[PDB]
């Protein structure tokens, strides 16, 4: 109950639906005008956010100290509204939880919440052909269209859904240090 209550308020206040030329994704605003999308959404100079064209002022594909993919792209958006600052909900290091909720907000999956069970630090995973670290794994028949989904537990935003192999789903951990 508490994790779903947390997730609902979090999506209401900080999530949106984004369409790029590579698909439709759930997007999570972090603070000010900075939001995150899975890297493979490959946002261009403009994205459709909630059906409307929003310019992207800056985009950064996150990588670790070795240059290894983290599968996250941080975007600075050209719009007046500031996102509610959720950085205090982001851990300093990968969080393993016994119960997590995956929240999706797309045209196809508007306001949907999925209890995915145990989340474990999976680590390295060759995703869509690329070595990727800091993956959090959960055992759910996950699909595309869930990409960008927000993985949460009570009072914690754990990561963003970036992939799956038809049986397990994986989220890029959303670490505090990525946003200062």
UniProtKB/TrEMBL annotation:
Signal peptide: none annotated. It comes from the Viruses. GO terms for molecular function: cysteine-type endopeptidase activity; nucleotide binding; RNA binding; RNA-directed RNA polymerase activity. Keywords: Capsid protein, Covalent protein-RNA linkage, Host cytoplasm, Host-virus interaction, Hydrolase, Magnesium, Nucleotide-binding, Nucleotidyltransferase, Phosphoprotein, Protease, RNA-binding, RNA-directed RNA polymerase, T=pseudo3 icosahedral capsid protein, Thiol protease, Transferase, Viral attachment to host cell, Virion, Virus entry into host cell. One of its GO terms (biological process) is proteolysis. Residues 1-179 form the Peptidase C3 domain. Its main location: host cell. It is found in: Host cytoplasm; Virion. GO terms for cellular component: host cell cytoplasm; T=pseudo3 icosahedral viral capsid. Belongs to the picornaviruses polyprotein family. Interacts with RNA-directed RNA polymerase. This is Genome polyprotein. The chain holds residues 6 to 185 of 252 of the full protein.
């Amino acid at each position: 109950g508490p994790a779903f209550e947390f997730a609902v308020a979090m999506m209401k206040r900080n999530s949106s639906t984004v369409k790029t030329e590579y698909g439709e994704f759930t997007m999570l605003g972090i603070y000010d005008r900075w939001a995150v999308l899975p890297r493979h959404a490959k946002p261009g100079p403009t994205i459709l956010m909630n059906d409307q064209e929003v310019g992207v002022l800056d985009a950064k594909e996150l990588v670790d100290k070795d240059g290894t993919n983290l599968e996250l792209t941080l975007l600075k958006l050209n719009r007046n509204e500031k996102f509610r600052d959720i950085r205090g909900f982001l851990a300093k290091e990968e969080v393993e939880v016994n119960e997590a909720v995956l929240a999706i907000n797309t045209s196809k999956f508007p306001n949907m919440y999925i209890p995915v069970g145990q989340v474990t630090e999976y680590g390295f995973l060759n995703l869509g052909g690329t070595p990727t670290k800091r993956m959090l794994m959960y055992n759910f028949p996950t699909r595309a269209g869930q990409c960008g989904g927000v993985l949460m537990s009570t009072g914690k935003v754990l990561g963003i859904h970036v992939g799956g192999n038809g049986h397990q789903g994986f989220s890029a951990a959303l670490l505090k240090h990525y946003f200062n």
